[PDB]
Every structure is written in structure tokens, then in C-alpha cells.
Scaffold this active site. Sequence first.
Site, short mmCIF file in Angstrom:
data_model
loop_
_atom_site.label_atom_id
_atom_site.label_comp_id
_atom_site.label_asym_id
_atom_site.label_seq_id
_atom_site.Cartn_x
_atom_site.Cartn_y
_atom_site.Cartn_z
N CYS A 150 -9.82 -3.25 3.36
CA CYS A 150 -8.65 -4.00 2.87
C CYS A 150 -8.97 -5.13 1.90
CB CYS A 150 -7.74 -4.49 3.99
SG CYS A 150 -6.03 -4.74 3.42
N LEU A 151 -8.57 -4.89 0.65
CA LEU A 151 -8.79 -5.78 -0.47
C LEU A 151 -7.89 -7.01 -0.37
CD1 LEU A 151 -9.48 -6.68 -3.41
CD2 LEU A 151 -8.58 -4.50 -4.20
N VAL A 152 -6.60 -6.77 -0.19
CA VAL A 152 -5.59 -7.83 -0.13
C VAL A 152 -5.79 -8.80 1.05
CG1 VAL A 152 -3.92 -6.32 1.06
CG2 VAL A 152 -3.10 -8.33 -0.22
N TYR B 271 1.89 -4.05 -3.95
CA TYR B 271 2.41 -5.07 -3.04
C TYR B 271 3.59 -5.87 -3.60
CZ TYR B 271 -2.44 -4.20 -1.48
OH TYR B 271 -3.65 -3.62 -1.12
N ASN C 50 2.87 0.40 4.20
CA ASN C 50 1.57 0.95 3.80
C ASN C 50 1.57 2.48 3.69
OD1 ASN C 50 -0.86 -0.18 2.85
ND2 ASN C 50 -1.96 0.35 4.74
N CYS D 207 -5.96 -2.42 -4.87
CA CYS D 207 -5.45 -2.04 -3.57
C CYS D 207 -6.34 -0.93 -3.06
CB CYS D 207 -4.02 -1.52 -3.69
SG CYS D 207 -3.35 -0.83 -2.16
#
Lengths: 248, 248, 248, 248
Positions: free
Chosen positions: D78-80, D135, D165, D196
Site C-alpha cells: 500500500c502506497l497511499v 483516490y 478498493n 496506487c
Amino acid sequence: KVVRVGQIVPSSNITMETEIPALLKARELVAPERFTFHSSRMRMKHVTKEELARMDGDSDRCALELSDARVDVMGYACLVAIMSMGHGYHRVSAERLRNVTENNDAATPIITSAGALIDGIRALGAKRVAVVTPYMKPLTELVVDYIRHEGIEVGDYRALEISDNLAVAAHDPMNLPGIIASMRTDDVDAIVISACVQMPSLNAITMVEAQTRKPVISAAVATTWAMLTALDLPTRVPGGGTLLSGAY
Amino acid sequence: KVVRVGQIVPSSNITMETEIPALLKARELVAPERFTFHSSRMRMKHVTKEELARMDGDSDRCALELSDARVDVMGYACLVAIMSMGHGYHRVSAERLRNVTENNDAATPIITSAGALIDGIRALGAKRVAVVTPYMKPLTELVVDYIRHEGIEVGDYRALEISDNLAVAAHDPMNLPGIIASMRTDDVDAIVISACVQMPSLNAITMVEAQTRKPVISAAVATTWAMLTALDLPTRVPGGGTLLSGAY
Amino acid sequence: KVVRVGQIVPSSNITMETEIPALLKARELVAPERFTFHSSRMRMKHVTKEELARMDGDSDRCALELSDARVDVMGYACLVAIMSMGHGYHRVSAERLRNVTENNDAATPIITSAGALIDGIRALGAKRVAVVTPYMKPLTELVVDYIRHEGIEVGDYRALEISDNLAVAAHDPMNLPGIIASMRTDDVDAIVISACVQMPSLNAITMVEAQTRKPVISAAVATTWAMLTALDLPTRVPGGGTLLSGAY
Amino acid sequence: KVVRVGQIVPSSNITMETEIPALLKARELVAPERFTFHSSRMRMKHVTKEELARMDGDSDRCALELSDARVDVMGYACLVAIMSMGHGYHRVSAERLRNVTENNDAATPIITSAGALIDGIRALGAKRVAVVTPYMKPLTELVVDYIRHEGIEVGDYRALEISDNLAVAAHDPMNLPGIIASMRTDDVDAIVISACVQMPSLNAITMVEAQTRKPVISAAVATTWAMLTALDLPTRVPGGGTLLSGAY
């Protein structure tokens, strides 16, 4: 579906039977169609103007041989052999070979690597082009002349002075990035990394394209692109360079 | 390593250029060696004794064409042509064709579909065998008799009797599971699902094997097996029947 | 189609995430359906009864995590944990875990390694079985007894007696061909090469099968078989033993 | 050699387990190394600042779970979630998780999709960047801010306003070419087609790159690139865009 892919090749040619299967093998990870490869050979060991004409005589016999297998597409390989016959002969060779398969009740679309390279460049909208060939100077001058005569301008070109078709097959592709990087490439719309059907180019294509930021074509990709288009199929193929990713 | 595979096929034949690439394509999921496939054709449309002798004459021509490509192994497909030349001819074809490749400065090991089948049966420890072929009666007699001549008992055998080579390749392989079950398979050491190089078999192979609980061989799998042993490579190929796993 | 595959594994387990992708990766050479693999872990290092019950508790947690990904099938790997919970528990685990996925608005079919093995053995028509496991004696008794409880006779069985789950995954599969040959296999309908989800077996499968001339099953192949039947997909998988070709 | 690839993912994330395996599967056609994929999940269904922090709490437990499998590389997805924790937190998360696997005797290199995207851009020598995210606005502002704060300028960016998601996973990638083509891309060195880890991007990458003539990165490729580099391996991967073709 299974697609029967037919390929007329020089006896000593090893690259078409490598890179075309490799590309289409790669396509099977992205599109449903599955491929089988079928070859006919015409004897030729050394790339000379005389040995090329002789090889083009067997051209018809190979097309007979392949139409016996009710093949979906025929790729006539040798690029240099057609361009050495005269101007715009690719169109002539295509028509003739098409007729052969019709006189065999197995009408098939017929694609030359010459015409595929010409059509491939235009499909990109590239008015100016750079060229790499493995052949001896005069033979590459024919290739350059032929392209120029097909309406496409040639900027900087290169001959690598190799006549032994086997030695051309054993030419390291990672020489190619360095070779191209020493050519004036920025004045040019697209890079013909192999105006040849025997010189390995596949493994340099994406590397070259990355460092030159210009689209890169080799005859192999141009032929697969043409084969794909002739069967009215999407042309997305990983590692196929610019031409093989939504351009059809 | 990249192993270059040569295949001499009948022009109409489409099965060998399918099932062998398919077989080796699966060996790539298990073993590091990569394969490229190179083919040469000999004119022949209808499977008759006279057209079989004609085709066998062009055998040498093809072996020249493929040794022009410095090929690592040669597969001479079509066992029926060999077995209709008389007893023990598989060894004669091998010997002569090897000489042909030597005489072209590229000595390579040569494998007949006939010899492979015999050698593959022997490698199983199978002394008795059931046979399925698509050929007419006389031509299936030749095959059965030839096998017997190589010290292998032939139990029950069946002919599909299709003379046109294009209809043989269009034969539904899912018929074969049934076709074989209506034979005698309990008194037989192993099953020759296809004593032909043109009839599709691969998709039925492990399925027949499952229900019969007896080892199943095609001409195709044997050729692939022989090629691998000729190269000193392990012979495990997924979905290739008994003969193709730690073979055998 | 893209089929999304969920797998509940022990954290240390490395075999299931190998052999099942490997199996399905091969099914892609034969059938058009593509697969993606999604895994969830439950802490457990050493294979002991107390650590097995602990791990089975976290079973629900995992089934939530994987149904968050709208997964097409669920594989609950580790049959020994199920069989050490008492007789018939595979059906109980299935039922409850299916409820868990329903309660998360993504109802999917759930498959235990235990249930698969039993069902796979049944699908062969096998009434007697030989078993090989890497577990200690008591834990192999539980498995053997549990199988017997499902109406399947257990002939000869063997334990490798490795308690550390990392040493089980480091076990050389080429030992197994030998290990099995020194058992009694003639009076037995089928061979459970691995009654474990952590011991590598796939590479030995068709090889054992060849020499024994008896059907060979691992927990892995059964899980893969069960998943395919749950989806109404054909069950032919190259190099997957008897159970994985027109199964069965 | 077999490389064990470890991936910490959101429970609902389906893309990393698709595109990373797809890339490395594609690499196996070009390089000898063969890969196996192993995942641990942390529960998360909806992309909100609170659900992201909670998910980052399980971050350690997943790294424990994966080190139980003595994995060669760990990709924290998970980048965010990282960028929403504060500035330059990717470096913090990396250090912490590295320590976890060390407190498990299985010291492994640890790669975050955040750090992989930052390192990926620099590795191209791209000072200015365009960004596409699925997002909600404020969440993407974090991503843009984080990148800007890492020394990289952001030209034109886009939010696609999706929080579910699952719906992000079912976003058609062929929307992306059209989306990017409506952004000011020429003022920009490289295109971040997916900042993302859940939004599918692989199938548009080469298409976008072709029509925009600027290098294209998604987190997936940046992560595989980083994973590859961390194992000191060549980074040539067909269909991997510019970054995955001789840039390491």
C-alpha cells in the site's frame, strides 16, 4: 483458436523462427489466440546478389509447400533478396505468391518482410528513418535506396560488413545499443534496428527505444505486426517495441 | 541454453509442428533449456506407397536445408514412409542423413520417428503393444509388421482409414480415448496411441493412460524423447505420458 | 477468463504457493482460463498438535482476508491440522468457512486439502492406498486413521519424521521415487506421495507413477483438482498425475 | 534458481498479486531466474485515512508471517497508506520492517511501493512528473505533496474519485490512455500512470508510452524494478515500460 503461422525462410536463417515465435508466445500472455509455427526453406548460406536471386526462384515452391498445410498467414522472410530485385518488387512478390496458394485451393494472405517494414514505418507516421544492417556496403545501399524510393527518407544508416548469414545470426544484440547510440538518431522519427531478417534485434529493442526515446522497428516485429493486422487482430505484444502496442 | 530443433515434415503435416513445440514448451516450465524450432518440407499430399517413396527421396534435400541452420538435432518425421521402405530402414535413413549433415560442415544427431518409436517402446520394457493408426489397411500392416520385426509383439491394432492427410489432422483426438477402450489393453504392455506423425494425439495422451492404466506413446512424444536423449538432457516433460518423466 | 485463486497457508509453508501455481501455470498451456493467486497466512512454525489447533483457530481470520478480495475459490491448505481436529472435520471446516465468506458479501466455494485428498482418492475408484508423510509417527497415525475412517483402506505407509516445517520444504523430492519403491505398491490402488502441503512432491509425481505403474496423488494436486471441479472447469493439467487428466 | 517473492498486501488488493507475477512471468522468457509468490494480508476494504492507519498496524505482523517462509524479497504494497502517515515515512517503514524480519532470524531486503516509486522516478532522471490516482481528492493531494516533498516536481495530476478498493480493481485500464491524453503531459519527464497499488495499469503502460512518447511508471513496475535491483538482477522485462528495460 489456433492460428497456423507460415514462414518461407532462407535455409540458414535462424532469427525469424526465433523472434516471431518469441513475440507471439509473448502475445499469448495478453490475448487469447494461440499460435503454431510452420516453415518452408529455400537454400541459401551466403548473402550475395547471385545467391539471393537463386533463392527467390524457390520462393514459389516454398509457398506451395506451406499451402499444403492450409496455413492462416504466410510470411516471406528475406528482406534483402526482394529489395535487390528492383524497385517496389515487394508488391510484385506478394501478388505472385498469393496466386500460387490460390492455384493450390488454399488462398492465404501473403506478407513480405520488405512490405511489412515499409508499412510498419508509415503506420507509425515516420517520414524520416535511421537504418542498421549487417550486410556489405553495396547491398545495404540497395536497402536504403529501396526505402527512399518507397517515399521514406533515410537519415543516418550503417552497414556492419558481414556476409556469412550464420555469423550474422551470432551477432550480439547488446552491441546494437552502443552502435545506435553512435549514430545521429535525433534527426529521425523511427529507428530500423534491423533492416534484415537474420540479425538478432529483439533483446535490444526496448533498451534502444528507452535510451533513444524514438520508436524502434526490426523486420521481425514489422512482419508479426503485419501478420497480426492481416488476421484482423489486436497488435499488443510485450517487448515488441512501439509498433507492437496499440497501433493497428 | 538455447537448443535449436530441426524438423523434416511432410508439407501437409501440421501435427509434428504442433505437438513437439507444445511438448518442449512444457519442458520449459520444468527445465532451464529454451528451444527454437526450424522446419523443412517435402511435397506429399496423399498418403500412398508411391507418394511415400517420392517423399523419402527429398529427405536428403531437407537435411541439407536444415543443417544450413546449424541445427542441434534433426527430426525426420513420418515413420510410415520409413517403414514402407522395408525392414530396418530407420537405421539406414539415420546413417545416410547424418552423413549429409557432416558433408555440410555441421554434424548433428538425426532422429527418425520410426526409430524413436521402437527405441521408446524398448525403453519402457514393453514387449507387447497395441497400435492405433489413421492409415488404410495395407499401410497399417506395414507398420505392425515392421514393429514385430523389431522384436516387439503387436497385440490388438486399429486403423482409422483416412487417406487424405488434411482429414487426418482434422481428426478429433477426443475420439481416441473411446476408440482405444474398445480394444484389448489388459494383455498389452503399452499403447501406441498414434503410429502416425499427422494424427493429433497429445491432448488424449494422459487421459487414455489414466483409464487404461497402461503406458501410452505417440510418434510425437517418442521423437521428442529421442531428441532429448541425443542431447544428454533430462527427459521429464509434463503431459507427455509415461515416456516423458525420468524416462523411462 | 481470469480465475482468482485464494489460498490459506501456514506462514512457513512454501510448497502450496509453488506447486499449485506451477500446476495451473501448466493448465494455461492447454486451456484458455488464466489464473491469479492470492494468499493468506496463519502463524505456525513447528508441526505439533498444540500449534496445529492454534493455527486452525486463525482459519476464520484468513477466510475473511481472502474474501475481501472477491476470490473465486478458497484453498485451506494443511490437511494435518484438519485431521488432528478429529474425524470428518474437513466437512465442518468447509461449512463454517463458507459461512464466513457469505457473511462478508462474497460467497465462494471452499476447499480443504483434507477433503480434496479423500474426494480425489474416491474419484480414482481407489479403495486401498499407500501414504508418505514428513510428519512424526503420532501425527502420521492421525492421517492414516482419518483416511481409513473415510472408507479408504491404507496399505503401507511411511513417515519421514521431520518436525521443523522449514526442513520439510528443503527436502529433496528425488528421494521420494526411491522411498516409495521400497514400499509395497502392487497390492495398493493408488499412492499418496505426499499427505502433506509442505513437502515438495510435484517433480517426483509422474516419475513415481511411471515406475510403480500406479496412480500417484499429492495434497497439492488434489486441492488443484477440487478447485477446478468447484468451478466446472475441465481438470486436465499436464504433469499433474493420473488425477489431472480428464479427471479421473 | 528459484526466487521466493514476498508481498504484504491489503486484504482487498488484487492488482499487486496480478501485475507483479505477470511481469516476473514475462521476465522468465528473457532471463533464467524463476519466481514463486508468497503473500500476507492485512484487512482493509475501503481506502480512508483511518482504515489505512489501522492497516499499517498489521504491517509488522505480515512481515513476521512472511519471514516464516525465509523469503528473498519483501514488497510492502500500500502506497497511499505510507504517504498518509507523514513526510518521508517510507524510509521509516522500511527500517522498521527490516528489523522485524531480523528479530525472526530471516534477514530480508524490504521494499515499499512508496520508496520504489520515488527511487523509480530518480532512476529515470525525471525531475518533473504527472500523476494518475483513483483516490478521493484530499488523499491524492497527500500523494502529490509527498512526492513534491521528496524533491520531485508534479505537473498535472488527476484523481478519479473512487474509494471502494474493489471498484478500483475493476477500473478499466483502457480508460487510462484517454485519461492521460487529456492531461498536459509534454511539460513532464515521466508519467506515473498509477500512483496506487490497486488500480490496473499494466495493459495500458506500453500503449500510453507509445502515444505520449514519455516514460510510463506504475507502482507495480516500480516495485518489481526495486525487487529486481535489490536482488542484484538485470531489470529487462517485456511489457514493463521504460523502467523495465536496461535501467538498473
